[PDB]
């Protein structure tokens, strides 16, 4: 029973291992194993539940263990190990074959097979930790191991793609430990975590690995948003080390999402409005990306309201996620009509729900835009309106107060009007008739480069896959 369960999963694990083993030996095929490693994460997670945990025990006995004998016992110690044929050396699949890691040449240390075996061993360990939700001592113990090992080994083009996915588990397992319980050991552990990311990021800079630098930047930018340091986030994004070529669309959407929150506090909403739109287009529409689409769609509504523009109501209607978008709908109506008591009671009841995503702190800045939008509505309907006529609409304090809210408006060129005090009314300065000026021609020249921007990323990408057609033989 238990014997047939251990040998079945190990054969499938070696079968997937031999596919990426022969591809890294000859020249550089490394682009190919990257596609296999995408499905390796999903196929291993479903396989971990079946045939219990014993698939990883016989795999370590098969190959040579540099560090991995005591790590399995420590991993099995927390789960109250059940010992069945647990003596090392019970299962031997090598049987002296070249693709099986021939034992005599391996045990005599005349050849080194540890490079691809050890780096692959740490990957399967991190998969079971996230599946079994093992925390506390097992989180810190594995962090003290993998990091010094990566500094000792010299990573090639294919080796840099191994640990590229391991850095995500280091930051993920560290944040789940802090949110579960707060302790002095968690704050000091985060200090080493921050200094470690910057040391390896410099290593990947010389190797110019696309997937490695894409995973690190996404983890580093998130650490800046938690601490809220402006000087660290602004200086990091000025280097522009993020490759846009071979990185996945899921890694791209996460990058544009960080730039929207950073530029939101910089009081420049022109660039931040484009970054939140590009993050939606790059993110897939499947169910696994709904977690990113849920947070990104909530940030888009906050960026629009801070620009003075009001987002469409169909976004809160035709979508299927509007159940969580209900708090933002009442904020939309309160800004339009400019009601004083409507916004106060709106943010009071939902104060608890908006605290989770930290979007309630941005609602304080939304209060200023409540009247600023109402001023734009009354200014477009009335070209010349008396000073006392505005206070009768929005029920403001006094005519002395409303005069200075239009002040903050046209400083940046929002309303584009003038206040005549002697005449006693506010007149709109826009005469339209701007088609004959050269101001539209400035934007017109940008649309030519936008269509030309699609050339170099396209015409060059035709022959890119085509080199395999002429080299391979055809019927």
């Amino acid at each position: 029973l238990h014997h047939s369960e251990k040998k079945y999963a190990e054969e499938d694990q070696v079968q997937e291992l031999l596919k990426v083993l022969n591809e890294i030996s000859k020249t550089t095929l490394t682009l190919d194993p990257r596609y296999i490693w995408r499905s390796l994460k999903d196929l291993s997670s479903l396989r971990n539940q079946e045939l219990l945990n014993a698939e990883t025990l016989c795999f370590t006995v098969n190959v040579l263990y540099p560090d991995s004998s005591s790590f399995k016992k420590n991993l099995l110690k927390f789960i109250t190990s059940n010992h069945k044929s647990s003596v090392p050396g019970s299962a031997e699949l090598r049987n002296s074959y070249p693709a099986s890691f021939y034992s005599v040449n391996t045990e005599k240390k005349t050849i080194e097979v540890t490079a691809e075996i050890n780096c692959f061993m740490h990957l399967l360990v991190q998969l079971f930790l996230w599946d079994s939700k093992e925390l506390e001592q097992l989180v810190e113990f594995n962090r003290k191991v993998v990091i010094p090992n990566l500094l000792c080994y010299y990573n090639l083009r294919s080796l840099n793609l191994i640990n590229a996915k391991l850095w995500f588990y280091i930051y993920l397992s560290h944040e789940t430990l802090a949110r579960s319980s707060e302790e002095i050991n968690s704050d000091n552990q985060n200090i080493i975590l921050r200094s470690t990311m910057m040391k390896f990021l410099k290593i990947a800079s010389l190797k110019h690995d696309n997937e490695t630098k894409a995973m690190l930047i996404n983890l580093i930018l998130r650490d800046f948003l938690n601490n809220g340091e402006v000087d660290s986030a602004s200086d990091f994004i000025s280097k522009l080390e993020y490759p846009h070529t071979d990185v996945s669309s899921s890694l791209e959407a996460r990058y544009f999402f960080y730039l929207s929150k950073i530029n939101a506090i910089q009081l420049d909403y022109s660039t931040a409005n484009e970054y939140i739109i590009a993050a939606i287009r790059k993110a897939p529409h499947n169910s696994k990306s709904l977690g990113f689409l849920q947070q990104s769609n909530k940030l888009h509504c906050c960026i629009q309201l801070l620009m003075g523009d009001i987002p469409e109501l169909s976004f809160f209607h035709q979508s299927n996620m509007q159940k969580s978008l209900l708090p933002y709908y009442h904020l939309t109506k309160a800004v339009k009509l400019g009601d004083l008591k409507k916004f106060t009671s709106t943010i009071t009841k939902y104060k608890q729900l908006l605290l989770k995503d930290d979007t309630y702190q941005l609602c304080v800045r939304l209060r200023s835009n409540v009247i600023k939008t109402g001023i734009r509505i009354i200014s477009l309907t009335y070209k010349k309106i008396s000073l006392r006529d505005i206070c009768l609409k929005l029920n403001l304090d006094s005519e002395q107060t409303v005069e200075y809210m239009v002040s903050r408006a046209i400083r940046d060129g929002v309303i584009e009007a003038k206040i005549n005090h002697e005449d006693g009314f506010i007149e709109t300065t826009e005469l339209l008739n701007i088609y004959d000026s050269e101001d539209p021609q400035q934007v017109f020249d940008e649309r030519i480069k936008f269509a030309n921007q699609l050339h170099d990323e396209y015409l060059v990408s035709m022959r890119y896959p085509e080199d395999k057609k002429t080299q391979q033989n055809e019927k």
């Binding site: 009001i310 469409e312 109501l313 169909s314 976004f315 809160f316 209607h317 709908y329 109506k333 339009k336």
Partner: peptide
């Protein structure tokens, strides 16, 4: 799709529309 569906108006129903008939004779 903006300022259209659910917000509506909540005016121009009866009382405001019925008042405009009396203004014709008051001129």
């Amino acid at each position: 799709e903006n300022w259209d569906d659910v917000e509506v108006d909540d005016d121009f129903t009866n009382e405001l529309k019925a008042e405009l008939d009396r203004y014709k004779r008051e001129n």
